[PDB]
């Protein structure tokens, strides 16, 4: 019939209302797999500091020009570590290297590069932690240090590069 079996076929209306939520998927067919997005990017940087009261972090993949002004908080003569977090949603990459420079009052003094290795196209993000690093000291050396950070590979492909400031404060914990 046309108007007798609908008394039990009503369950279809309870799952047909959910078809409108499937329609929203058509609004965002990018899947982060289009050529308009890069292969590997640092999702953020984190500063693990066992001497500090709490962990530090900074967001990335955005307005890297802003980080040339904003700074971090460290302590004079303290020990710290740098953790870099990056996602890989494209292909395997090898010979990956993280470069870290240090500029005092607008003058580079040295730089160090840390090999991260090779990583595959995992839907998640990988993290790399540096060894112990010391901080400068004296009230004149409490100024903002520019750090330049770069990521490259054995294929000479720059993934991202940024730069961020660092306030060396006298206290950070009491």
């Amino acid at each position: 019939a046309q108007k007798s079996i609908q008394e039990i076929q009503e369950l279809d209306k309870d799952d047909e209302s959910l078809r409108k939520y499937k329609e929203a998927l058509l609004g965002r067919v990018a899947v982060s797999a289009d050529p308009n997005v890069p292969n590997v990017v640092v999702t953020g940087l984190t500063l693990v500091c066992s001497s500090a009261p709490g962990p530090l972090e900074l967001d990335l993949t955005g307005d890297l020009e802003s980080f040339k002004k904003q700074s971090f908080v460290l302590k004079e003569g303290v020990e710290y570590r740098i953790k870099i977090s990056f996602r890989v949603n494209r292909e395997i990459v090898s010979g990956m290297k993280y470069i870290q420079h240090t500029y005092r009052k607008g003058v580079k003094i040295d730089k160090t590069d840390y090999m991260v290795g090779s990583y595959g196209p995992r839907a998640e993000e990988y993290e790399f932690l540096t060894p112990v690093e010391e901080a400068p000291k004296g009230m004149l050396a409490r100024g903002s240090y520019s750090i330049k950070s770069r990521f490259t590979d054995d294929d000479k492909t720059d993934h991202l590069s940024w730069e961020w400031n660092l306030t060396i404060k006298k206290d950070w914990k009491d």
């Binding site: 500063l47 500091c49 500090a52 009261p53 709490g54 962990p55 530090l56 972090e57 900074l58 967001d59 955005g62 307005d63 802003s66 980080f67 002004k69 904003q70 700074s71 971090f72 908080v73 460290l74 409490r142 903002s144 400031n165 306030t167 404060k169 006298k170 206290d171 950070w172 914990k173 009491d174």
Partner: protein, 94 residues
Amino acid sequence: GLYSSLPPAKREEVEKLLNGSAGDTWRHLAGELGYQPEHIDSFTHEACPVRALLASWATQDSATLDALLAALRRIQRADLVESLCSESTATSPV
């Protein structure tokens, strides 16, 4: 100038750099802002009260940059002030 005049990334950095500063740096700021002592005992109980403090302060016109800077000078944080003032000033050479 108002704290609302700063870029979104500044407002995030004010929180993210203060997590490395003393666990009670915000406690000094709140005392000089004229916040009541009972509100300080409610904030120190939270995990990240420094983030909520900026949002609760930004609820009112008193949240000017000039007022925030003035209060940071009273608590001997002129060090941290000068470094955040790198964006909080008229500068754009491009």
